Paper text:
Btk is critical for the generation of calcium flux in response to receptor activation, because it activates phospholipase C-γ2 (PLC-γ2), which produces the second messengers diaceylglycerol (DAG) and inositol (1,4,5)-trisphosphate (IP3).
There are four PH-TH modules in the asymmetric unit of the crystal, which form two dimers, similar to those seen in other structures of the Btk PH-TH module. At those sites, residues Asn 24, Tyr 39, Arg 28, and Lys 12 coordinate phosphate groups on the 2, 3, and 4 positions of the myo-inositol ring; these are also the key residues involved in IP4 binding. This site is on the surface formed by an elongated β hairpin involving strands β3 and β4 of each PH-TH module. Residues Arg 49, Lys 52, Lys 36, and Tyr 40 at the peripheral binding site of one subunit coordinate phosphate groups at the 1, 2, 3, and 4 positions of the myo-inositol ring.
Author numbering: 2 to 14, 21 to 80, 84 to 168
Write the structure that this text describes.
């Protein structure tokens, strides 16, 4: 039940919005929670995914004109301290039965760390896919294949 990885990520998904969440990875589950900054501790649980139910973990093609909150910097005035909890420019994908979960990492190294660990723990899942969507699902379709089913088969082999 011990946590393998712990990070603050920007989580996405009608109405599409982005919230800061504390992500936890164990061998069994990935849970995400609210972060109580005022008291500096983990807050209320918001979601949990069975690791064995995950079918795909990959990066996502970055959006074209992203808001500052997802754009790399002024980090001379702002230390890494501020930017590492305000800027989340690197997205990756976590696909399970309900569909794709989109998560934004503050650094490339941290995304690399999480994708690597995730791949390790899902290595024996029965349903790993062979095709996936490298582009985000938005307003009823994937931007990579124009397919309008959230669980439509992937259009790219990797
Ligand atoms: O408005 P937030 O504080 O961002 O919470 C949202 C909101 O959930 P709540 O109604 O519980 O506040 C979303 O719900 P809708 O706007 O779809 O009604 C919900 O999505 P789901 O109910 O569809 O699960 C989403 O959660 P998620 O992105 O896990 O789907 C969840 O955001 P958080 O789960 O990240 O707090
Ligand atoms: O939030 P945690 O401290 O990680 O507690 C988890 C969590 O339980 P709750 O979030 O409901 O308290 C798991 O529950 P879910 O994510 O399914 O809702 C549950 O996992 P199981 O589904 O396998 O019961 C698990 O129980 P366990 O570790 O006995 O497997 C339990 O951990 P605790 O027993 O430490 O509360
Ligand atoms: Zn596609």
């Amino acid at each position: 039940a011990t946590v393998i990885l712990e990070s603050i990520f920007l989580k996405r998904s009608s109405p599409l919005n982005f919230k800061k969440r504390l992500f936890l990875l164990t061998v069994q589950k990935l849970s995400y929670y609210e972060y109580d900054f005022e008291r500096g501790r983990r807050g209320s649980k918001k979601g949990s995914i069975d690791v064995e139910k995950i079918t795909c973990v990959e990066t996502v093609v970055p959006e074209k004109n992203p808001p500052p909150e997802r754009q790399i910097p002024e980090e001379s005035s702002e230390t890494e301290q501020i930017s590492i909890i305000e800027r989340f420019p690197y997205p990756f994908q976590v696909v399970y039965d309900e569909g794709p979960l989109y998560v934004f990492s503050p650094t490339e190294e941290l995304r690399k760390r999480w994708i690597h660990q995730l791949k390790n723990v899902i290595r024996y899942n029965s349903d790993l896919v062979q095709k996936y969507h490298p582009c985000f699902w938005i307003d009823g379709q994937y931007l990579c294949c124009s397919q309008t089913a959230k669980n439509a088969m992937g259009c790219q082999i990797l």
